[PDB]
Amino acid sequence: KKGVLIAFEGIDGSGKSSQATLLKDWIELKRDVYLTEWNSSDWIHDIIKEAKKKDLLTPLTFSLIHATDFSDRYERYILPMLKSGFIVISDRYIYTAYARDSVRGVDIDWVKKLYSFAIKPDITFYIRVSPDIALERIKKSKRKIKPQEAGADIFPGLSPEEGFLKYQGLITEVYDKLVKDENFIVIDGTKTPKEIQIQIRKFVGELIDNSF
Template identity: 35%
Template sequence: MRRLTFYGDPPSNLLNVGEVRGKLIVVEGTDGVGRSTQIATLRRWLESRGSAVIETGFTRSALAGKGIKQAKRGHTLGSITLFLYYATDFADIVEGQIIPGLRSGYIILADRYIYSAIARAVVRGADPQWIRDVYGFAPIPDKVLYLKIGVNALIERTINAGRGFNYWESGMDLRLGNDMFDSFREYQSRLLRQFDSMVGEYGFQVIDADRPADEVADDLRLAIDGMLSAS
């Protein structure tokens, strides 16, 4: 059991949550670094140990998920509007999935967390302190596992995995290069710099993601195992 703590000032309805039995484990890292594959493996492992798991992520909320998809399609969304739309969506996930899950004793596996939102916003010109303040309603996780990779290895993965360069993952809205490749390299380099700068600030546990998936999975299990047996 632990008392839920937050990055900033939570509203009064969240202050009264009290003790929670569950654990919040975040898997962070940039686009295409292998988060979803790793989360699927972790889930099977945790369930085989007898833990109940809830997976959660971005733009999946009942409230704003649909609105964001529609608004992005139009390409008329301003940058501050988009940052706040994401924050709304995320708050809905925090209050609708994460906190109820933690209270009921689930292990919450979060595919991305506020760090991705902060990195994307800062790369798009948001004031770094402002966007951190906006996400003050977020509970502090029990563990943040950061899948770290360099930009060259990321490019190789992106091509080999058959996904290729897409519009948003290349940051094409920022017009950072003449084509998808130039833009992808520049945009992802900037995102990685943001993630790397958050390692100390938020206490990320760094996992080298430039390795075969099963080796990465071993490290993730080890980190979680240590945390679960310590509590």
């Protein structure tokens, strides 16, 4: 009957992506649902970054490019679907921008005001896990750490492993500082994917049943 916005926040390797997908799989059995990812930038993002590919951009300009691109995604896809009664699940939401931008020196209060045009999630799940554990999982999966996951732009002198630990650690600190103000539902990401999802569904089930 009413649209609902569910957000997932967590570091790379925390498993929040899997949890968002698992929740979509369950919700779609009964209701219309749309799953998106913060990382899924659109056309404005591409036009500006390509146009300025030869120039060195500042954290502030990147913050604005991302907000600009999101403002379009928001009005074009997200908000319309919510108004239509869709349940929207976002694998990483505006809080990821809060973290990525503030860790790079952009004023936190300014970034919050910048994104004030966007509605807050009905529920935000923070899949919390130590960067050390997240790293172990990535190592065991045999895949390599991406420069972005290692915050290579900030820590080019560190190995991908050390960069990951330092950078994801800073992202974790931002999320931790946002928990109380943003009413994050903190989930112990060290638990099994199944136990985590069960907890999530209990929270979401209660939410939807009381949604009318």
